[PDB]
Design a binder for this molecule. Structure first.
Ligand code: QBQ
Ligand code: QBQ
Ligand code: QBQ
Ligand code: QBQ
Ligand code: QBQ
Ligand code: QBQ
Ligand code: QBQ
Ligand code: QBQ
Ligand code: QBQ
Ligand code: ZN
Ligand code: ZN
Ligand code: ZN
Ligand code: ZN
Ligand code: ZN
Ligand code: ZN
Ligand code: ZN
Ligand code: ZN
Ligand code: ZN
Lengths: 190, 187, 190, 190, 190, 192, 192, 192, 189
């Protein structure tokens, strides 16, 4: 909740101030005076998806169109946080679905990405949660989700493989059972 | 209808300027109620058209059954939920059944439905249904790719997001080989 | 103000409902029922720059540095509204400046773009307001601002020149007086 | 300079602060995906700030060889940390210099980027420090440094301008005094 | 100037001439595919030369507003007819100008391209006419016009140089006298 | 077939018609830039329709070789320039041809020459596309032929609908290129 | 496995061999630019072959998660630097790995660490490709693994055939990646 | 096979023929720029046809390894320079080779050397494509081989039809590359 | 200069050193996949350093023919870092303004081969190409730009995957006249 955010902000700032001292830095120097608070607020914003529910995000934007054709929202910018290192992983989400007389509002597909990506995560879980949320909200014939991301933990440190990218895929309903629907989806997201 | 409704549209746009905190009397805004009203009538000019007039009897005989595609047709529509543009491209394919449509008419058909208050899904289906009813072909495939400004300039603000809708009728739905040839040739 | 927005929202919705009827549409059909309110909110968001002042936007993010080298923030996505047709014009803003004793917070250069772009505008005025705001806030040796935009009024209607783009340029202080400074700026924004 | 003994001693304090952040965000620090996170996040942050453990003399490692023509090392991948939000800023560094009978080892130019980028920083300071370090180590006729970076604090939050990039430039010696040397440098780094 | 009355009076004469061309080429004007061709070719030709029906004053439509900046409208799609062979030449027009107290409506620069390009022409004349029309309408400090076009007379026939392109340039006022203004224009139209 | 003698005899009639068009458009046929136009436009139009002067037999010129070759042959990116028969305005693009020989192999250049016979006429894309495929089929008797034509029609860009980016793609698949989807897929993959 | 003590003991022997190579090439090991070369070349060669010092278990470091996922996971564009065992000249490129988990998901970075164990050795592209796929299969027991290696061999560009654009692509498909063409096709579509 | 002794003996005859060509074109063989041309043109033509001096066995040089690899091996983007037998004008491009080894794996560079044996001759694209595939098939006895050649023929761009962008693509699929479409699809996807 | 007799006498020494290197790395130089490696590695190293055998006069081969800019750009270059004995590869772009003599186009690339096929440092290699052209033709000026990826900076050490080194040498009018140098740099893009 927003009350939880206000109550936990000083605790987060104290932890960030302690990190600055433990790294050998001077929390009292000009450039670092407001850093405990700004880092705490940024981390709250990066994890704002914990504050959201699918019902509020959908906001009744479910329409009735006699549509039994493929709908895709691709190149949705995604910014998440690795739960192992607390370092960002960023990329794109491509979503496809085959409606079953209930059609979702286009923007709501990107809002669903925001609920789960703005959390401490792993790409596999994030990919599956987006597909399951759309499946449960719309009850469509099928859903396909592809996430492509650069993990900063693999480029700025560790293995330091500058070009590496992780691609995760989740195919539910007809997107799993019918290879032709999955192939049309993968062709159209290029 | 356009001439009669132009002053009502201009009165509504002038009222919007005042309600936003702007000064409708300032030099840059004096003609805005009229220009905005004319622009909105042009963006919704598809309501003035019928398929028959647009086709203009441009249907010719072609005995050999080959796939015909008109791709990269620039499309400019209006979102019916926010009254903000959604723009992109339409790619149309069909397999004739002895009748072939005039090439330009495929783009004119896009103009009838796109120049209206719409939703991408309905727009995509209308183009495919109009071609199906006009030509009675073996099948039709329509792919619409668009940037909705309501998802980039506001709301979710996902700068690169694009919506892709597809409608496959007749052999384009029943035969995956026909649909695959269409999708390969529109790249 | 936000109070002005709440008070004027029903008047904006009434005007948008009237526009739906005047276009030949049915405001009672499912797809249009909430449109007067949604269009009103979208228009208020597109013109939220009238709710801001340079001082609040700057938020005292002016640092003292021994930096007398070129600073550029380029490819700032910009979304504005043509004041003549009430149709969007969108593109990018590239800003460069040579600090004297004060250096502005990087994000404030993009926030300055937001104060002026979220208004009913003309590209030339927008370009000049960004350069003047930076000049008055920082008193630098010079500022350069380049705005490149697609006007939907020239693409979706009127002349209908699909590829046309407007580029405006404002060069102040050393960016006007010293061609070498302006050339370095234009080379670095490519 | 920060030592490896300081790192071992401060690691538990950093881990305690990161565990506290996990709890203050509303997360479950006992869940499988978070069990080792306090330690992994602490190690990642020590690696991101390893530049405090280095000195120019150790980094140079006597790699100065006995030429008065332009030498450039461009597209050096750079990963830094914003000191205001503790969020990465990443991109590229392009360095050019005109030797004065002493040529630096090519790799040492990238190692100099590492000393200063692996710290809590601001782009302007980082750009100046690289140019000054090369100037003091080699005493060349001049040095030019261009840093281009995406600040995640401007993409994942705040203004959320997905394409925004910051470009900073420092020109010293003949790179400032002679526009022809600076022009050759900027042409060759494209 | 040519009028819709002249158009309707000359349409049967144009159609008779196109029918005669069909017979003189060895074709059968009575075959299904050619029956309406004399009329459709005649209408297309009078649309390609619709520029003779226009005047600068009507096209400007008083869209002159009351700046210290370079204004450019680039990538204006241009379609003209070669006067020597009556075959299209197509490409792009890039216009730049420095206003002197009067600023022209953005779309009018593209409308000015339409008056002169929709005629039987030579590229050099078309380029000069656009620059002269802007100069006389606005009285600016200077104007620069660059036209790049593929002549179908050089690709479909004659020399048959598939990739050949003609680039013509006209620089007036400060765009001719000040190389710095011309260089800024050429850099910004890339 | 149209002859060079027919061209000489009809040139003055074409020039008179083009001179008449100049006057009917409001132009001055006597101005310097237009003096030679009736003749130059007439010659250009005869060159654009020179395909009526040619035969498949003359164009092939016996360039049919024998071989134990049963592998795919493609000539792609053949620049094509044609004239729309409805508006007498160019349509331009590329032709991609594939075929599976049946012991007879056509000379590589002849595939582009076949494109020239039919494209240099008053046409429609669909007719042009089948004519190229049918000519190859009848000349070689191969296992199959595939023809893909991609073109920009200037009548859809410079006028009418004015859709700047629009392109027409027509496809003709005969023999094994129609019956075997695997052969057609190899062809479409290799022409990218 | 090779140890850090073995590296310290063998460093002078490697330096003596590199100093001998400098003399045998006609160079002067005493000139300023070559004085430290025997030691730096020796250290670089030990770094290029550091994969002999590693074991899969240490490299994995228990980064196997037991959070179910029955969907395709790919780590593509992993920069790869190896050494040809026949010429002792580098071959460099990228590795693209895909797998279908069977209730065990590997840490993303470990897939790149697996590439490092085998590529930092004297190798042959075919063996390298197979070792990465086998190591993942044995560590995770997944439904299947696919590995694609694309590399420029400097032995084919700087010498020998001297084909400057040549690239070698090797592929290994195990489990469902071999048995189910639909799984393999999804993998190859997603690595583009 | 043509020998280096044959080259020395025939060099004056080639130079006499090239000197005669200079005179027959209206040129002056005595002008400074043409004095050595008969000899340089003769040496260049011998180099362009040096493939007649080679045999598959010498080129392979026993570079056949018995590592039992059951996975796809590709060498793509092999620069190819050949000579059209019909006009004596170059045709240049790229060769992409794929194979599935059975019990024998060929040395990577030998696939490019096989391209050199056949391309450095007076050729026709179809024959060249087939020869490369048949040589690999006979040398290794693999499960299958796929060869794709893409080339620009200067006879179709500098003269004749003068289609500046035209490209010829030839394909040969043997063994499992013909019988299994899934193997052929993996090959064509991996050579993009 | 290095002779073919020196190559025959020194090839054995290089092979014995590579065999010793294989053993010192923990490998088995007796295993099937390494049996021919000492000889192959020795031959590859001789090929990479064949430039010490070449003289400018032999390479030129009298290809000098009897006042506008001439450029040969995108010359593929493969050299060896003298500090680590690892390749550095890229492109060389050469421009010159002839006086009365014009060199044969290929000789500019053959001059790149003389100096690049040696143990080098990019700076020296760039200068040696410009000086060789200057001394052979006595032109009004020469400009040389070398762009290279050093494998010692990507496969090891700093491991900066995208890093590139660009070195430049401008002699005669290419140094003295900035307009000549600008024409050269614009034309090599
Ligand atoms: N499957 C999956 N895995 C994920 C994330 C995010 C992170 N991870 C992975 O957790 C592992 C942690 O291992 P560890 O304890 O050994 O840490 P550490 O020494 O710092 O590792 P390293 O990075 O090698 O230096 C790493 O392998 C990392 O990649 C995700 O989205 N999906
Ligand atoms: N399927 C479909 N849906 C369409 C369009 C055009 C628009 N829409 C969608 O109508 C929904 C309206 O929702 P709402 O009432 O909650 O509004 P609002 O708070 O302003 O939303 P948001 O924009 O998210 O801030 C949105 O989801 C929008 O995307 C289309 O073509 N196809
Ligand atoms: N300098 C400048 N000019 C601007 C804007 C925004 C708009 N404008 C321009 O005002 C002019 C208004 O003219 P008008 O009355 O004739 O309208 P209308 O018939 O609808 O025009 P048209 O579009 O041709 O159909 C147009 O030329 C338009 O382009 C800007 O940012 N900078
Ligand atoms: N010149 C310079 N400036 C730098 C950095 C790194 C960061 N900054 C800038 O410090 C300012 C601090 O502002 P603030 O206190 O108001 O914070 P906050 O509300 O979170 O801001 P915001 O991001 O707008 O939400 C911001 O403007 C930020 O951009 C750098 O390298 N160079
Ligand atoms: N400066 C200028 N020149 C222009 C145009 C348009 C056309 N032209 C040129 O008039 C010349 C007429 O010559 P001509 O009589 O010999 O014609 P013709 O034998 O058919 O020629 P060709 O095409 O070579 O076969 C041609 O050279 C043509 O290119 C333009 O915009 N600017
Ligand atoms: N299938 C096919 N159709 C072709 C060509 C070439 C042209 N055409 C098409 O003939 C139709 C004629 O219609 P019409 O009489 O109404 O003309 P007109 O008012 O001038 O039309 P418009 O252009 O819309 O303004 C148009 O649809 C045009 O596109 C081709 O190759 N294949
Ligand atoms: N399959 C496979 N093969 C590999 C490597 C690495 C190298 N090789 C290949 O071994 C062969 C050695 O033969 P050889 O004795 O004739 O040597 P040499 O005269 O120097 O040859 P060449 O280079 O042509 O001059 C070459 O064909 C080389 O390419 C690999 O990873 N996979
Ligand atoms: N299948 C195949 N065909 C090949 C080559 C190489 C060349 N050719 C083709 O031999 C034909 C010879 O015909 P011809 O006698 O009529 O000559 P000529 O008048 O000069 O022709 P043209 O060029 O049109 O002027 C041409 O069609 C040429 O393309 C190849 O590799 N594969
Ligand atoms: N100016 C110049 N310098 C060149 C080359 C080729 C190489 N070098 C540079 O010699 C230096 C040697 O340093 P060193 O002793 O410390 O070795 P080592 O610890 O292994 O280094 P490192 O690689 O950092 O790990 C490095 O800086 C290397 O880059 C060139 O062409 N021009
Ligand atoms: Zn991580
Ligand atoms: Zn909307
Ligand atoms: Zn407007
Ligand atoms: Zn920050
Ligand atoms: Zn012409
Ligand atoms: Zn037409
Ligand atoms: Zn090798
Ligand atoms: Zn030929
Ligand atoms: Zn090195």
């Amino acid at each position: 909740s927003e009350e939880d955010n206000e109550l936990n902000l000083p605790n987060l700032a104290a932890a960030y101030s302690s990190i600055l001292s433990s790294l050998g830095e001077n929390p009292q120097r000009q450039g670092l005076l407001k850093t405990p608070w700004r880092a705490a607020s940024a981390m709250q914003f990066f994890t704002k998806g914990y504050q959201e529910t699918i019902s509020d995000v959908l906001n009744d934007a479910i329409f009735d169109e006699d549509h039994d054709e493929m709908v895709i929202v691709k190149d949705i910018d995604m910014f998440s946080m690795c739960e192992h290192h607390l370092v960002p992983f960023v990329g794109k989400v491509h979503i496809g679905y085959l409606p079953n007389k209930q059609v979702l509002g286009l923007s709501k597909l990107a809002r669903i990405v925001e609920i789960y990506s703005r959390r401490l995560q792993v790409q596999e879980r994030l990919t599956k949660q987006i597909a399951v949320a759309i499946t449960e909200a719309l009850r469509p014939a099928g859903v396909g989700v592809v996430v492509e991301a650069t993990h900063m933990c693999m480029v700025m440190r560790g293995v330091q493989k500058m070009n590496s990218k992780t691609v995760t895929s989740t195919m539910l309903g007809v997107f799993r059972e019918d290879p032709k629907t999955r192939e049309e989806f993968l062709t159209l997201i290029r």
